[PDB]
Amino acid sequence: IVLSLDVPIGLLQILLEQARARAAREQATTNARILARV
Secondary structure, three states: OOOOOOOOHHHHHHHHHOOHHHHHHHHHHHHHHHHHOO
């Protein structure tokens, strides 16, 4: 994307490792939030 981000692949992997059960609660709400934020 910007430069490399290969060495710190864990920094980005984390966003897909511990974000699973974290984003799962948001992916459903945020989706509806976009079309029904209020």
